[PDB]
């Protein structure tokens, strides 16, 4: 009665759903072919959340993977859990974006939406009670920031009322991976801002940082990176598939986080991480769990709190737990870093605590934050942005597929415009 | 350019067959110019003051404030500084049968400060029409209904999926603006009073438990005047060019969804009213902060309304403001939260300025 | 299935086509016969991958290319050599002379007759294609054939296809050495005419080659059968993300972008860091610090222009093999840290990354190691310049006592269309320089 639709878009959200539907079903217990070789019943009160089911007791993912390079989705069918897909919601077409902006959204992708949407109608109206999308990608491209943000603009005018929870990667301040990554990025935020909920921004740099400082992973691959995002796309959807003394579905974590409409980007994070040996001398309790989380080097965001504040944030435990353990921890916080708090909201945490940990742990804890820091990952694409606009960098390849000088002036005012909406909170008063 | 303030006034609207048959206790009073609001708690009596005050309650007592009245009081001196060059808005406020879709746009029989501006504008344009000046007017006339753009003046298709929408766009130095609204070529006043009764016909409206004919949607009434003027010169004349806006707006009202009865369609337009009127509030408060020195971001962004009214609420308009409200017990609340909006919006001011359009061609540079 | 058409042209991308051709069939697993008994072995695959190899029912293998000359002894090399069952004999090769160094010839005169013949062959391979990627075309500036027949041919092309990248691989001509006295006025009448159709013409020095395989390989006397088997290494790497799996895959359209601000500054430059021989292949780490640096080292550069006289406006970075990617990223930080690599102001990125899990394979007979992991960098550079200009002054130098003009207006060519090219050619040379200028 609480579903989630699973779309992919482009490279990076592929090959992160195909980690990701390889950590769910390590929880609900399904195998490679959708079969069932579980232990506990509560793997299956609730897999219509994710999951629906077929004839042979089997269970197919809502997933519908769009690309526009045929090249990655044949990667995810030949690996390990390929075949539980199914093969109608493999969408895809020809003449890849090119890492252009305006071909995922004006020229190819503009051929090809239509054959998306018709799936996700199908995979909706076949839903008892719709709680909101869910869709996986990265700025920087052209597939997932083009047909990516379409798809959105297309679902909120035809499904309003539900949440579109976007998980997607911004550009890193250091070493890019896409020479025109501004140029996409603030197109992109133009969209984000106006169609969607909740927002969880990730970098690279940082889950470079994460598996380099505290994992202590020497030869870290995407396959790595992206078991750290999974296990952040699964903590906030908990409390809707397991049960808990304190639950919290999507919509609790929106209203709770999001105080202004436009302020709905959050810096993500888990706990607790360690090393192949190091879990030997620590141990497991909500005080080590919330050091961690509230610890600028956990974060996901390559953006550091302590140059601003916490508007909102949210800490959603699992496991066996004192909810005073919970509660005097997440308010000893407030109360000794208050200056990194906002004084006109007098409580600035939730919490929500499931009682069924992750497949191999005592207990786990996901942290999701509203920070006046976001403005780091804007600025830095804002003056990018303009010391290439201002010459005209790399646009004929925008301008030639239908595309105006505007309307990247427009995405320019709205970023600055959001960034300034976090400055006013910045400072004291 | 130089400091000016929004004009606000306030409409003290007679009971209504609801109030007079659910017999209430007139609870607005005005002291002179002063507004006063006498709570049935007794508490005390709240008391509020404005550049100007209406009461249209009565129909015989001295202070009788009727259409032609308020507009001579207010919409007259907008034109006088339209005609000067600058740009004027004028925007309505209030709660649900208030007399908003009155005091702008007025009955058959009791027309509006928008059929009494512009017949005057076009008469004093018309007594003005000398070789001199060449005169130069369009119009628009649009709507917001669920966050949507509509165009008023544009006839409906054979089909009843006709409100085609449109949408709006960020021009980098005129501002925002409508992509797609069919401006009209303005000759005189019977040609503005066709297309404001096809505009209004084509309206969204709909009957409810506290009105039989409000307004679902916001609406924008848009004028552009343009004055080219000519002067002797030793090259081409007809240089000199005054283009002023004129904007007229006719708000929706609050509506707690329970003296209005509603469901389906009617709520969603009224949760989406809500949300708008909101953000508005947003931005007076803002910019009355502003007005104080402090430093203070404005919401234009979180509406459509407000980001077509951009540049009027504060920006570059000699703006004013009516706000209406009922004299009854049972719409204390909304007359309270309308009275200190109101009075919250006299602290803004904007920096207004003659629309000379010669910026880097001769004449801006050799001022 | 994803496709890219080769074209080759002249005796000098003819003997490249023969070096990458050896090398796409043995990385695949193709026999010079066509067949593949891996999947004769196995029951079929797409080992035999379709971007340049199609596929026919008794198992053989042709490959998507095109063999144009107009001198029969460089393809009668090819229908009588190793490789003769596996190309269609169809190679449209001319029975007639040759351009004898004379763009007018290879483009009007002896170009006619044969382009038609060309252009349905290239047609006929694009009709069995689900979707076209590009072209990838070989010639050498200084023949007629290289430099005319590829200025006629790009020039239809831009109009029956239009919208597709069409890449160049060219060789450019030496400051000091060179094989005819008439390189330069062949080479500017080409860009002339390229400029406006083609979309990234990467560009080599056959001078570069000479001396990278001095130093690192230490061969004191190669001939051209070393050149290309390391020229056919650089089009391999940016062919393999359409050929293997890999994390970061760039296509083609990727290289048109990020490499080409401006559409006619489109005169990147390649190189490729791991030219070690078999003794130096042990004694080294091979790392992706060490092989990265080493692509911005000047004397790996494939083309004679030190780049420190100029400034990067974008940078792509193929890498292979056992690639981590946080090793690539600490690389691309310590690049940043240094000054003698200095960026436009316009381009805070700079670069662009790909990543590829199938190593580099070793061509037997031949002189480069196995190595497991290897890099190909493809710079937009503003030093190009000094040899825009090192060219032009040959030109003017030549043509103000208008020698060797009447060969060329013999075969059907203005007095001033050289004039109007050299003009062409002293606009660039301003574009530039105003592109490299620090904004205010
Ligand atoms: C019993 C034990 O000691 O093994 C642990 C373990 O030692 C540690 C190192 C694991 C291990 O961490 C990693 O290996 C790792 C590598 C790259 C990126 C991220 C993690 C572990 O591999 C990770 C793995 O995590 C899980 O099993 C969770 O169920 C996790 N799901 C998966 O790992 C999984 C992924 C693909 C297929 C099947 C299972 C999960 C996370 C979030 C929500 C639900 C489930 C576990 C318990 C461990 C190992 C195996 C060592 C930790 O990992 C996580 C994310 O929980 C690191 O800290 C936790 C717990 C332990 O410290
Ligand atoms: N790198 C490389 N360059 C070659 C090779 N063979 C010829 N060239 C170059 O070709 C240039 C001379 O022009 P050609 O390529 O022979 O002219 P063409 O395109 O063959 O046209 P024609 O000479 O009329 O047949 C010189 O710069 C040579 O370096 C080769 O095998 N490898
Ligand atoms: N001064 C007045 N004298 C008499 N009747 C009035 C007066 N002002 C308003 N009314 C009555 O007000 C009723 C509705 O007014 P209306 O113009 O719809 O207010 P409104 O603000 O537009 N309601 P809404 O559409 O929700 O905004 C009409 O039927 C008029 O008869
Ligand atoms: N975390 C992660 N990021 C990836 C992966 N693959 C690609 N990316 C990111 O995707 C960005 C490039 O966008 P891309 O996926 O190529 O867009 P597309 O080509 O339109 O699909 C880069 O910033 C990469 O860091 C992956 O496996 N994991
Ligand atoms: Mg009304
Ligand atoms: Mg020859």
Redesign the pocket.
Known sequence: MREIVHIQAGQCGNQIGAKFWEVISDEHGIDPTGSYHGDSDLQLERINVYYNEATGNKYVPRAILVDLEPGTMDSVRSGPFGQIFRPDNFVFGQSGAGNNWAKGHYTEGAELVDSVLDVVRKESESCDCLQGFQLTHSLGGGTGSGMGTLLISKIREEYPDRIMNTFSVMPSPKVSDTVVEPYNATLSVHQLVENTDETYCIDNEALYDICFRTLKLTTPTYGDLNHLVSATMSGVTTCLRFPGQLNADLRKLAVNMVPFPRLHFFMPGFAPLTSRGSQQYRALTVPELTQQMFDSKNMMAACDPRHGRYLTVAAIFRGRMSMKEVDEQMLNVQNKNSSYFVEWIPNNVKTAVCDIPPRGLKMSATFIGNSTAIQELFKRISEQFTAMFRRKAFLHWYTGEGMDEMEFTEAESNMNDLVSEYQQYQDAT | GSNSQVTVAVRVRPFSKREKTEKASQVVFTNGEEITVEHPDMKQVYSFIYDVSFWSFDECHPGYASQTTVYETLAAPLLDRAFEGYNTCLFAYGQTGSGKSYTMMGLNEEPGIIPRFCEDLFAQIAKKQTSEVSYHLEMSFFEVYNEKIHDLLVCKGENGQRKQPLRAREHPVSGPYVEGLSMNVVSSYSDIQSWLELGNKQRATAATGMNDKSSRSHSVFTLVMTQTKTEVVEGEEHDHRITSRINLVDLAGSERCSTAHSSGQRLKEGVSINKSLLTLGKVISALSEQANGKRVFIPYRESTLTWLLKESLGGNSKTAMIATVSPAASNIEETLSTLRYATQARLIVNIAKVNEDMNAKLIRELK | MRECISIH?????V??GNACWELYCLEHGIQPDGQMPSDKTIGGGDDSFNTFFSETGAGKHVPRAVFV???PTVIDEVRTGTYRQLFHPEQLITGKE????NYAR?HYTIGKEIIDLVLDRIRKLADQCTGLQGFLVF?????????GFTSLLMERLSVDYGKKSKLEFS?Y?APQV???VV?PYNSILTTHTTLEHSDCAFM?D?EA?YDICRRNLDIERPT?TN??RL?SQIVSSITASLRFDGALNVDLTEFQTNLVPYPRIHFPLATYAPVISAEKAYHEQLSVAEITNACFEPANQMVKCDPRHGKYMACCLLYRGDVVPKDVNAAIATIKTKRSIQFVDWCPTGFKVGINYQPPTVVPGGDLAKVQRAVCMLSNTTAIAEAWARLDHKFDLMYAKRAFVHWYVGEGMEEGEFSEAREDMAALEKDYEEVGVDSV
């Open positions: 042209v002249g005796q000098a991308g003997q490249i000359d107009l001198e040759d351009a004898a160094n290879g010639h050498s500036f200084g023949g007629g054939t290289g430099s060789i001509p060179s094989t005819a390189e080599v056959n080659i051209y050149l290309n020229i």
